[PDB]
């Protein structure tokens, strides 16, 4: 069965999937995206060197690709990230001028978002803002504009498409007692009550064996940050086992603002850990044991 449609007969909006042109064009990829997830983001195309690899000068095939091939078979989409470290060319990473940054951040975000304008749910707007300890990361945002740039990412990113939902993610909050997850509860708290427009925490988890358990209790701590939606990324899993992913679909189950599981990959071979064997499909394809134990969680 599609875990997509059981997850949607739950009450959630979607079963979602990581991807791009590079992996549509070959393969099984497609038709298993088409039968099993209902909502596809994209891995590389939409991060800023493949978007604007030189000022002004926007790059939008593969992103146009992926959001045609969306459209055309019926998937939501997810969108980022639009602020972060990763991904970042020499040419903004080099900037002084704090008048500079802002205004190439603004038409950044401004310009992507409005090409898509209404047809993006999700938008991973600011991504991977914390340290381990809660405080803030050194990025050349931080350094140059102050801790003023992320209300800026926001309230630009409003601006430009009022219809998406606009998140911030990071990693490493998959424990109620880390440091970390705590602190974006918090901070997250205190910028809505100034008006920052977050709609959405999304929990990058790389899990290893046995961290599934701990996602119980760290769920529903996301959650009190009050805003409309908590969404779960599961990047990595090799070393987990399906009691690893039963407890994370549970998690979502039971949290109510939580929307839908992202999973980053089809199939094993394609993982950045594709030998720990952390997904869903094999390198044959063919379904794990653990994506059985979704579809039976699921179930009835």
């Known amino acids: 069965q599609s875990i997509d449609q059981l997850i949607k007969a739950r009450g959630k909006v979607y079963f979602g999937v990581a991807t791009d042109q590079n992996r549509l064009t070959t393969g099984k990829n497609a038709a298993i995206i088409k039968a099993d997830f209902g909502m596809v ?13 030189s000022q002004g000068n926007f790059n939008f095939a593969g992103a146009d690709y992926l959001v045609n091939w969306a ?15 990763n991904f970042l060319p020499s040419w903004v990473s080099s900037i002084t ?36 300890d809660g405080s803030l990361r050194q990025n050349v945002f931080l350094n140059v504009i102050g801790e003023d740039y992320i209300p800026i990412a926001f309230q630009t990113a409003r601006a430009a498409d009022p ?22 509860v918090n901070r997250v708290k205190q910028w809505r009550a100034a008006g920052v427009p977050i709609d959405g925490i999304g ?44 407890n994370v679909v549970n998690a979502c189950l039971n949290v109510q603002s939580c929307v839908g599981i992202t999973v980053m990959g089809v199939a094993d071979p394609d993982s950045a850990f594709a030998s720990s064997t952390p997904l869903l499909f094999d390198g044959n394809f063919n379904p794990k044991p653990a994506y059985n134990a979704i579809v039976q969680d699921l179930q009835q």
């Open 203 to 246: 929990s990058q988890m790389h899990l290893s064996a046995g961290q599934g358990a701990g996602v119980l209790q760290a769920l529903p701590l996301l959650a009190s940050a009050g805003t409309p939606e908590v969404s779960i990324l599961m990047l990595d899993v090799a070393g987990a086992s399906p009691t690893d992913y039963v």
């Open 41 to 53: 983001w994209p891995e590389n195309s939409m991060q800023w060197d493949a978007t604007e690899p």
């Open 97 to 132: 001028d704090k008048n500079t940054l802002i205004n190439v951040m603004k038409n950044h975000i401004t310009t992507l978002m409005t090409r898509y304008k209404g047809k993006i749910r999700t938008w991973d707007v600011v991504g991977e803002a914390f340290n381990e």
């Open 71 to 85: 459209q055309q078979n019926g998937k939501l989409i997810g969108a980022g990230c639009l602020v972060w470290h």
């Open 163 to 184: 219809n998406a939902k606009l998140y911030i993610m990071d990693y490493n909050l998959d424990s109620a007692s880390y440091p970390k997850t705590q602190a974006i």
